[PDB]
Write a protein that binds this DNA or RNA. Structure first.
Ligand SMILES: [Zn+2]
Ligand SMILES: [Zn+2]
Lengths: 76, 108, 85, 94, 148, 99, 82, 93, 109, 83, 99
DNA sequence: ATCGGATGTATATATCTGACACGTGCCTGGAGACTAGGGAGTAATCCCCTTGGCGGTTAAAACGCGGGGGACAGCGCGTACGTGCGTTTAAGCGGTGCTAGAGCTGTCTACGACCAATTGAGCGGCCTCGGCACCGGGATTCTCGAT
DNA sequence: ATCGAGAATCCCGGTGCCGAGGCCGCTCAATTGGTCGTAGACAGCTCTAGCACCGCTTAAACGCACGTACGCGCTGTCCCCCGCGTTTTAACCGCCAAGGGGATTACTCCCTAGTCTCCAGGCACGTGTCAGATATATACATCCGAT
């Protein structure tokens, strides 16, 4: 299933992920294909935060959904 | 300076900028508090504290001790001129007084 | 005995000393570097890192920071370096 | 348990370690330091508040604290405090 | 002004006695901007890793610290992904007497081992302190793919 | 035959000893009882924390030391060595304590 | 009820305070004066201390009340809080 | 133009209440105004400090009463407290 | 009171209640002001100013003058004990000094 | 247009009149120099604070309110000039 | 033939006259010039309101009168009628102005 | 012990003038009605710190005596200060000219207040060891009566 | 000028104890993010008074001569704190025990900041007249030399 994520830098990324994959799994996959660390990633769907422990399918997220990525810059 | 870190480190101070900001806001001093006031106040407080502590440590070293005691603080405050003028009304508990005997009373 | 040349140079700016100041840690450096340290640094001596706030505050009232006997030997030993500055 | 009581103990200890690396401090001297810090804070803040109210303003900016420091402190302590305040504010802004 | 002369003497000293396992050069004709190359120490899990960093000298030197960033990316507890470096000597107690060669040596030393006291990211520091192997294998998978 | 110190050389020794110490000089229980008497005169059935009487005694000692310093200065100004109640009254008047 | 406790401040205590002050020769008519001035000062401080500990609807005199009473009179004290 | 507030006519009313015929010059009026303002500042500051000292957040009548008891000497303190209590009692009904 | 007249008249006070309340609220003293504080403060201020005005008027009438001048204010403040103690560290512009001469300076018999 | 040694403006009869108001019958010959010195010290102390108060407000003319405020902070309240 | 008063009498008459009077004692223009000279040291080219100068001079007169009263008290204490600079120094030091 | 100048101060009377008491327009701040929400009053509970008490022991206070040093009274002097008068100096009062700068109005842009979530700096509690207190011995240094 | 004996003080070494510098667990407030009402930063205009100048007084300052009274030094007397020794007293330490109330939590309720609308109390402004400051001429308090 293809989903769309939007970052703060104006870059849109398409993820080929299944609903069975948990939040940790999708974080690992997006880190592998984009480099952004999973911990610094905050996921926003319909204006809500997504918890790592629960699975992605718990959010009732369907094909071509829109996600927002939040980067937590610490230090500097 | 770069953001996204603790405020006490951005200014290079040790006193808490956030605590000073909260005290200024909730101290009934003014309706609004600027963003540069707590840093300035923290810097001044740190300077004064370091200035007193250095002289106190010098007095402690002179007294062959390796610990700061109220007598050392009193010696450091009173021996200096500017700090004596500033702290001219306070009274350090268990501090004593400087050794001073009038020249007339000395034996001839 | 001898002021020499390599030891004479300022440890910061690599230049000739101008109105040298002697820190309580027996560190010697030119007045421009010390001044720029006051308003653009941590107010402590860079080398051995000891605070000199009290000494500077006491001396600035009486204007005794400059080392007269060192400045005299600097003038008499290297007039050519001093006249350029 | 007992309610929290804020204090300046750790900060004064850090400053003392910064100045003298191998010198301790007793509890009574710590109380003296806390009282001195509170007194100076009260003096500066009250002077700044009065001086800002004198100008029909409603904000305590850095200028008010600078002028309060200029008024309260003696001749040389005031200059050094102003210099190090400019230090901190310039380093914080940029 | 006077800063460029100090930079010239410092670069001459760098060239006459280059430190082992650190390299530096002028990224551009303009004097302030510099580039540097670092490769990991032998006693480290970063073997065979080459890294590029860019350093920007301030308007006046050395009274203010010089900004440093990593154009490449490193997986370290004390460095962000964007390249910001939390170094105690760099910002908290930078002194004019120090030279940037000492700064690079400090960067190498921090690359050898992180500092518990001021973690850049608490999670990675928690990972590092909790045990050894779970940082070992991410470091091992990380080193070759990004360096080469 | 016994070694008797000349009158005057013991006061200087006492001055040197006491100006070097930091201990309290007034007694504890008499001062506490006096404070309690004053308080019960002002208000009945009061209780005192130990730090309260400690601070009261510290303040009283510092004030009396300052008063005696000023009194000694006045007595020395009067071309004398002994201190007299007139010196204390004048010091208090000039300090503005009585007026 | 306590009566005539000002005599608890005996002659040697006054002499020790005077020696710390820096006097060499003390008259014999000064002890009553010192007792009187000490009583006046104690009354003045304790009045404000009692007013503070009475406004707060309490019944004990904490060190905070005394430190505040001293601070009100231009006699700031360090050591017991603040 | 701009308006400046003062306690002029109030002091004049009090003076006429206490002395029907005697007048007052301008400088004496300025002095009385300054005295009133200074006393107001003192009492308000003491009341605010007392309110802060007990972790409160209001200034009711009792803080003003305690501040008056502190600031004024004995007989004047007693008279001021009595007058204030009477004024509050009359105003509340 | 009747809850229909002015606050000053309701409290029986010549000094204002609204102005004192506004100054207390806008004077940066507390986040709240009680409903009885301005009345108490105005009563205290009125009592003190009435006392000083009475003393000054008495002193002026004693001096065969129908107007109150700063000299009369200084005489009234200094002569009384409580007023002098309350205003010990204040200076009256064009106030003068109480007439007194030390007994030693007087001429001998 | 600078000014020099105007401290001599405080004249000996003026100091004599001030002492007479204070209640002094006989005056020594060295009083005047000490009086002038104390005068200069006090005036400097007040003027520094007044000038600082003026400088904060970005003004160029010191006002009676500035002097009153400086005196009040210095420990000597003044009445009659507005406050 | 000429008639002159005994020393010490017209001084008392001057005291009685001046204590009753209220007008300022020091001349206006010298004081204004002194104030301007002192002020120009801290900052250049200031301008002074008249009321500020008047207030400064009034505070000056009050302070000097108080200091002279204290000095006279010291002089009478020292069993003398004449005041001298040591009396002024003692009065200032007790007050704590110089410390 | 007063007397007679002789000076200065106090007292009675006209006068005219600038400031104080008062009338008036109006507008900005004070007054009146409604509401909601958080601060403050009230009740019940815990245990911390205050108060009261008794036995030992001993450092400190109280009392008495010899006397030496300082407080104080009196004499003498000579010099600095008070008093008065002729003379030089600049403060004081009036009038005019001008512009630097205080004070107010109109725009609007950037700094600061507010609310949620969150997690790490900072506070309460435990603990162990080293720095400081105390005792015993000796070495050093003021001190004074007799030379 | 000094020698030496009695006494007070400082150094040094050994032993012991308690508080302070560090570690661990945890609860709350500082940080970051965004949004939104308004405060003062700035430009322009006005128009007040602060500064500069001049001229005419006459009030205050000044220098000098002369006398005198008191600040200071010296001498003498006496008396009263001081240093020391002996005796009495209660401060101080340790211990135990009872309980008053200070601090805390939970609940509720009502006081007041906030908003909007309406109107009069006091302020800026202008005006009348008389309280008193000034000038002039008597009447008494007070000081000084000399009886
Ligand atoms: Zn240099
Ligand atoms: Zn150094």
């Amino acid at each position: 299933m293809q989903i769309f994520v939007k970052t703060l830098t104006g870059k849109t990324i398409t993820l080929e992920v299944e609903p069975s994959d948990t939040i940790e799994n999708v974080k690992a996959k997006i880190q592998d294909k984009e480099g952004i660390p999973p911990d610094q990633q905050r996921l926003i769907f319909a204006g809500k935060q997504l918890e790592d422990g629960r699975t992605l399918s718990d959010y009732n997220i369907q094909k071509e959904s829109t996600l927002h990525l939040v980067l937590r810059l610490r230090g500097g | 300076s770069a953001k996204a870190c603790t405020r006490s480190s951005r200014a290079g101070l040790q006193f808490p900028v956030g605590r000073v900001h909260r005290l200024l806001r909730k101290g009934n001093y003014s309706e609004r508090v600027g963003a540069g006031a707590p840093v300035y106040l923290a810097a001044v407080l740190e300077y004064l504290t370091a200035e007193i502590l250095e002289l106190a440590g010098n007095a402690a070293r002179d007294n062959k001790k390796t610990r700061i005691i109220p007598r050392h603080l009193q010696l450091a405050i009173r021996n200096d001129e500017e700090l004596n003028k500033l702290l001219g009304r306070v009274t350090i508990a268990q501090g004593g007084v400087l050794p001073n005997i009038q020249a007339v009373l000395l034996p001839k | 005995a001898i002021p020499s040349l390599s030891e004479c140079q300022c440890g910061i700016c690599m230049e000739i000393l101008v109105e040298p100041v002697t820190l309580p840690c027996n560190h010697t450096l030119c007045k421009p570097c010390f001044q720029s340290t006051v308003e653009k640094a941590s107010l402590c001596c860079p080398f051995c890192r000891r605070r000199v706030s009290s000494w500077t505050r006491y001396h600035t009232r009486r204007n005794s920071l400059v080392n007269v006997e060192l400045w005299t030997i600097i003038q008499k030993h290297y007039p050519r370096e001093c006249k350029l500055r | 348990k007992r309610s929290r009581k804020e204090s300046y103990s750790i900060y004064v200890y850090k400053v003392l370690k910064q100045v003298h690396p191998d010198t301790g401090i007793s509890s009574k001297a710590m109380g003296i330091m806390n009282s001195f810090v509170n007194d100076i804070f009260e003096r500066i803040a009250g002077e700044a508040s009065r001086l800002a109210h004198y100008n029909k303003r409603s904000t305590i900016t850095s200028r008010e604290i600078q002028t309060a420091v200029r008024l309260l402190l003696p001749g040389e302590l005031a200059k050094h405090a102003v210099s190090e305040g400019t230090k901190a504010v310039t380093k914080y802004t940029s | 002004h006077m800063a460029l002369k100090r930079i010239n003497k410092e670069l001459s000293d760098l060239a006459r006695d280059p430190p082992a396992q650190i390299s530096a050069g002028p990224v551009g004709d303009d004097m302030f901007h510099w580039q540097a190359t670092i490769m990991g120490p032998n006693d480290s899990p970063y073997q065979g890793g080459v890294f590029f960093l860019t350093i920007h000298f301030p308007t006046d030197y050395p009274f203010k610290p010089p900004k440093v960033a990593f154009t490449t990316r490193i997986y370290h507890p004390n460095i962000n992904s964007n390249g910001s470096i939390c170094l105690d000597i760099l910002r908290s107690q930078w002194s004019p007497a120090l030279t940037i060669s000492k700064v690079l040596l400090s960067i190498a030393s921090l690359l050898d081992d992180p500092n518990p006291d001021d973690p850049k990211v608490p999670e990675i520091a928690r990972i590092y302190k909790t045990d050894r192997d779970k940082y070992n294998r991410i470091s091992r998978e990380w080193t070759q793919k990004y360096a080469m | 035959k016994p070694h008797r110190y000349r009158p005057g050389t013991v006061a200087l020794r006492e001055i040197r000893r006491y100006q070097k110490s930091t201990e309290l000089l007034i007694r504890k229980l008499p001062f506490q009882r006096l404070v309690r008497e004053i308080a019960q005169d002002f208000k009945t059935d009061l209780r005192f924390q130990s730090s309260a009487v400690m601070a009261l005694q510290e303040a009283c000692e510092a004030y009396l030391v300052g008063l005696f310093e000023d009194t000694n200065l006045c007595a020395i100004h009067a071309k004398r060595v002994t201190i007299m109640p007139k010196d204390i009254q004048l010091a208090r008047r000039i300090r503005g304590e009585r007026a | 009820v306590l009566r005539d406790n000002i005599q608890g401040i005996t002659k040697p205590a006054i002499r020790r305070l005077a020696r710390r002050g820096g006097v060499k020769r003390i008259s014999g008519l000064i002890y009553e004066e010192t007792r009187g001035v000490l009583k006046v000062f104690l009354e003045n401080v304790i009045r404000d201390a009692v007013t503070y500990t009475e406004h707060a609807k309490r019944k004990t005199v904490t060190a905070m009340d005394v430190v505040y009473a001293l601070k009100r009179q231009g006699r700031t004290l360090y050591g017991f809080g603040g």
